[PDB]
Design a protein around this nucleic acid. Structure first.
Lengths: 156, 167, 281
RNA sequence: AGUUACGGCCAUAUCUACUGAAAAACACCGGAUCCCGUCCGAUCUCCGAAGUUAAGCCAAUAAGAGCCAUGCGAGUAUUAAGGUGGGCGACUACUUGAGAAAGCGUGGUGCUGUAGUUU
RNA sequence: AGAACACUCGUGUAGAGCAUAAGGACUAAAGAGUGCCUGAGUGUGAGCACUACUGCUUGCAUGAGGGGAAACCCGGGCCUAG
């Protein structure tokens, strides 16, 4: 039978990668955080204070409050077939800034131009949506340089 | 000839081993006379019943001399060994060693309660620049140009004291 | 044993570059620089003091992501502008360099007229004048050098304080400290204005005039005597506070690129090997 | 264009042999009176310039070891969905999709930020 | 003075140690020494582990508090049990 301590089953998780042992780099400590940013959790096994519980490893959430050397992040979780919000305390050594909003922020920068012109000249924005890839395109071909294919390889 | 690139003594190491009680005090007083220093007592690494040694028990005393004082002692000792050494006594590193059985040959008066002890002499030779391997900031390994080799150590001995190195 | 098998090399992890070079302590650096997440707009300045065989360097540095930025700099070798002839790594030259460094800063920030100099007459920390702008703030970075009573790094630090910058310090480190008694500041003043060396010069002339010439040749060439030092140092300090050194000019030393060696091409490397086989057979 | 002080990413930067280097630096170097610390002025701390490019730091060289990239291995190994497909089983063919690794070949061998100094 | 006594020089990515299972962590240290101290303080909040008890993480205020030149750290034991 299995046990139920705070760091159960973390032999693979919570171990350093090959040729990457030691303390964190300066960039870790010089990064500034703000309320409302999206942030991503990855535990550093060498630091023993401010570690989250291993369920949260590799998950992304939103910063709710900022303190001297730690952050409070909001998560959601299913328990007993219902949704529950959870507020997780994490030290700054175990977090990295998330990339999940990157494309959306670029798209907002384009929208922000159009939405002004749409008051002056038009009435409503064109709004620049994405579209999924359509059907295969048409082609005009010169028809020299033909290559033949054959079952010449007998494959003993 | 090229200055720098010339051999010197960097250290002479002296040790007496006498496992037991008041013997170590009696011994220490000898080292305290031969050189103007207070020697360092050393302790047993293992426990060995046959030799009469418990672990962490004091068993020996040593002192390390440098500079002018080193020259006097070495000359005083090589005389006792009559300027005769064997090709066994030299290392691949530019160092050499010998032993003496009777401390009174170094000249001190007997005092029958103190006793008779032997002593080990070990000598380390050098050329300038060795500091590069010992300083705190920018510490680095020395060049092969600036080591002392087995042949050079023999040549220096022959030249300096006119001794004879037997095969 | 170790270095005899390939696996030793295949599994090895290198230290960071400035650690291999024995120039930086990362455990110390991180404690010194790490950001406080609530004090937004705080921008801590390190005072970096380093001592070479030739000179003393003071730099004021701010640590930013991507690389440290130098705000200002001063070097004991520049004191030759104000007539310093001798002892560029002396305890006095340490103090003087810290003084110079401070003034250059407070001029850029325009605090210079508010926070006046104060030549070594107390051991208190610099205090914010009411109704005016706050003092410029810094912390001391001594690197790999040891802290002990009367180390030259602390001389430069007192220089900066006397110059008007706010550094927190404890008097435990200065000469003239006593374990359970008031501070004897005349001993400190004595060293700043060079008494320690005068007292050595005076001794040697009674002991051994040969050794004196060997030990102090450079001083002799300037006709300086043990008696002259206080006047020398008082003038030096005043001049630092009073004057300003001329700006540096920029020049293209570009043409010295002639001296740079260039690596062999592939074509050459191959022919060279070919010839080596043929020379051997 | 190098160097030097403080750095960023942490081997294209490591490890082993050899060889070069104008200027200014960087060093080795000469002492212990003081402050400071040792069994020991070796290390650490202080006060110095008589020497020296021998060393370190920097740079080149090597059908070098190791690291980094790419091509091939290879539509190969394994695998999602499907049928009144096959086989006593062990397991395996086909249809619509996703898709490796080791080895071995070929090329590389640090790049950059702020300030200071040197034709 | 021996297989195995003390002292040295060169190599040495851990082949050692870290009181007590097993795993993880650690190299100018968290290991081995040396100095000083009793923070193994005092009030009162918010949370994490399926969360009552329990264990841990973290906020603000105070001490004629500690260690350190200082930045920093400390309301038990390197982390996961007693």
């Amino acid at each position: 039978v299995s046990s139920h301590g705070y760091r159960r089953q973390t032999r693979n998780l919570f171990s350093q990668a090959f040729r990457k042992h030691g303390m964190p780099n300066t960039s870790t400590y010089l990064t500034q955080y703000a309320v409302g940013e999206y942030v991503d959790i990855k535990v550093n096994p060498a630091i023993h204070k401010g570690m989250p519980h291993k369920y949260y490893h590799g998950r992304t959430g939103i910063i709710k409050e900022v303190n001297r050397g730690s952050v409070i992040v909001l998560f959601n979780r299913i328990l007993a077939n219902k949704t529950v919000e959870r507020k997780v305390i994490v030290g700054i050594e175990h977090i990295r800034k998330s990339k999940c909003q990157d494309e959306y922020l670029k798209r907002l920068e384009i929208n922000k131009k159009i939405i002004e012109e749409a008051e002056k000249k038009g009435e409503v924005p064109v709004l620049f949506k994405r579209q999924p890839k359509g059907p295969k395109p048409a082609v005009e071909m010169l028809m020299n340089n033909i290559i033949e294919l054959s079952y010449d390889k007998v494959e003993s | 000839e090229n200055p720098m690139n010339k051999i010197k003594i960097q250290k002479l190491c002296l040790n007496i081993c006498t496992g037991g009680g008041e013997i170590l005090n009696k011994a220490s007083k000898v080292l305290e006379q031969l050189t103007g220093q207070k020697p360092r007592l050393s302790k047993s690494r293992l426990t060995i019943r046959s030799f009469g040694i418990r672990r962490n028990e004091k068993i020996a005393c040593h002192v390390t001399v440098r500079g002018e004082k080193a020259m006097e002692i070495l000359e005083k000792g090589i005389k006792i060994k009559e300027y005769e050494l064997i090709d066994s006594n030299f290392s691949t590193q530019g160092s050499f060693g010998f032993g003496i059985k009777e401390h009174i040959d170094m000249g001190i008066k007997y005092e029958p309660d103190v006793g008779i002890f032997g002593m080990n002499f070990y000598v380390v030779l050098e050329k300038p620049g060795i500091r590069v391997s010992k300083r705190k900031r920018v510490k680095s390994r020395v060049g092969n140009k600036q080591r002392v080799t087995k042949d050079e150590a023999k040549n220096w001995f022959v030249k300096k004291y006119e001794g004879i190195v037997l095969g | 044993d170790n270095k005899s098998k390939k696996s030793y090399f295949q599994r090895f992890q290198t230290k960071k570059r400035r650690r291999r070079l024995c120039k930086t302590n990362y455990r110390r650096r991180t404690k010194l620089i790490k950001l406080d997440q609530k004090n937004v707009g705080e921008d801590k300045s390190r005072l970096v003091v380093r001592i070479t065989n030739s000179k003393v360097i003071c730099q004021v540095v701010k640590s930013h992501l991507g690389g440290d930025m130098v705000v200002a700099q001063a070097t004991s070798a520049e004191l030759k502008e104000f007539g310093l002839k001798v002892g560029f790594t002396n305890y006095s030259a340490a103090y003087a360099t810290g003084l110079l460094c401070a003034r250059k800063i407070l001029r850029m920030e325009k605090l210079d007229n508010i926070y006046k100099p104060k030549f070594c007459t107390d051991v208190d920390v610099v205090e914010d004048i009411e109704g005016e702008k706050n003092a410029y703030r810094c912390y001391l970075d001594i690197g790999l050098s040891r802290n002990s009573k009367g180390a030259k790094v602390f001389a430069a630090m007192k220089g900066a304080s006397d110059g008007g910058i706010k550094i927190p310090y404890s008097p435990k480190i200065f000469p003239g400290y006593n374990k359970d008694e008031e501070f004897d500041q005349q001993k400190l003043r004595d060293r700043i204005f060079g008494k320690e060396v005068a007292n050595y010069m005076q001794l040697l002339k009674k002991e051994d005039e040969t050794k004196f010439k060997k030990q102090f040749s450079e001083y002799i060439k300037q006709n300086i005597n043990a008696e002259d030092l206080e006047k020398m140092y008082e003038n030096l300090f005043n001049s630092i506070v009073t004057k300003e050194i001329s700006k540096k000019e920029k020049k293209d030393y570009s043409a010295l690129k002639k001296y740079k060696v260039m690596k062999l091409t592939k074509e050459e490397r191959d022919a060279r090997v070919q010839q080596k086989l043929v020379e051997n057979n």
